Amino acid sequence: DLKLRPLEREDLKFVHELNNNAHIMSYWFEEPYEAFVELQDLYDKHIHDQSERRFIVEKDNEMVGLVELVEIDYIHRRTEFQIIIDPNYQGYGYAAEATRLAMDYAFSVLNMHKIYLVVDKENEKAVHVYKKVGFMVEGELLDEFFVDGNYHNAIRMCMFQKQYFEN
Template sequence: MDEAVGLRTLEKDDLEFLHTLYNNGEVMSYWFEEPYKSLAELQDSYDKNMSNPHERRFILKKGEEKLGLVELASIDYVHRKAEFTIMIDPVQQGNGYAITATQLAMNYAFSNLNLHKLYLVVDQINEKAIHIYRKAGFEVEAELKDEFFVKGAYHNAVIMSIFQDDFYKA
């Protein structure tokens, strides 16, 4: 029997897995960040933010296998919105996990947190990610020109969002 893909709360023993992802240049280029993060820095961040009510961090898993990281960040309970981020282990990419993770995160955001809006920022050249987000119901809200400097060049970013009502209609 196939084990279901799901989300579970990020735990301290997941930090070595994240350390590997955060130091992968290809992965971090899509996060508009330098692949430079020490394990000590991750541990410090975990300790400082583990009780932060404005963040939810999850490990995407299949059984005991870690597939990636899913985050709801900058959760704003007044305006009922949050930023969605996702990072799939390069070894696991191409298996359909990103769409499943996106749907799980949307369900959590809209059902558990009762958010009104979920948004994300994606590199305009990341066509695969944009396709996945569109498939999940996200729509483009804006384009930010020359927003991020990655690998020696400026990249445009796209802001995409989905609203709670649209999620429940789908």
């Protein structure tokens, strides 16, 4: 069955391969990086930084994706969620299960009150998967991302602890 495990430094190569194929502008603890050694230096720099928690999503000891809890705020008890899945594993529905795992970790382990995520308004699939797992649309950010030649809006969706526990 699908599993989460803490992200190890030895896994960074895999992570890089991910961020290579999906996009070109990747960040680590909100600092931008392009090359693998950049990613390694940021990892070493933020080794004990508790503002972000990252998990490898595994299927029978096989690395199939990455879950990221970023901008963790332990006073307002909220965190932003980001998920990436290897395109060699699309169709198995792993996105929803990994999102559910991350929801369980954030609400049941981290004792968070709110989870939120931001998707491009073109990616209607992402909006449907996230509505599937229980997210509600919270806002529409105007020209939030300059994507390949022009500005794109984004959908911010959110979900809360007590709503999650009762499902």
